[PDB]
Nucleic acid binder design. Sequence first.
RNA 1: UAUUAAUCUAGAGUGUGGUAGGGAGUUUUGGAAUUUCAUGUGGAGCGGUGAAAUGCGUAGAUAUAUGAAGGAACACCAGU
Length: 114
Amino acid sequence: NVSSGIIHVSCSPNNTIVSASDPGGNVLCWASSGTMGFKGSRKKTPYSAGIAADKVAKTVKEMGMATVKLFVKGTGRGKDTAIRSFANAGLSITEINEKTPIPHNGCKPPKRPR
RNA sequence: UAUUAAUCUAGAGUGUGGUAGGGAGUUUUGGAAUUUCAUGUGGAGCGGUGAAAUGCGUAGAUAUAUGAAGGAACACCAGU
Ligand SMILES: [Mg+2]
Ligand SMILES: [Mg+2]
């Protein structure tokens, strides 16, 4: 019932999440590779991210919005598959802002696996 | 060569004039980010891996927005 909104596309290296939300807080729908039905390691493939983006795009288009600001987050692999899925869905993409957390040399990261 | 009695400025210092620095200690201040807590939206997974399983989750997790608390370290500048 709202024309403009935000789409948070978080791409973890292990999984992906797409949350369609009102311009200020109050997420309106959400989807992820797990809710798609993919399980285990298949959740981290770009195709699963595209599937999740397509489902959420169809859902929110039937809900009836037009303009989307796409907030890209994380450092996965299928970071652009969701972008192309939304573009193919056809919602008016206005902004491509990226908001993956960057630190200013605070907090100690985990150990390096070997 | 050593000792003694002296002179000299070229070694080494001192003064005046230019001057570059993440040199050191003490006392205040700041912003990103993680975590926890509080309050809204939401509804089945999240997390993790070579693949999974312990684990967290309908007592409403992951996500999203706002606020508070505290701790540690100070992106970019940053380098033939
Ligand atoms: Mg590790
Ligand atoms: Mg916050």
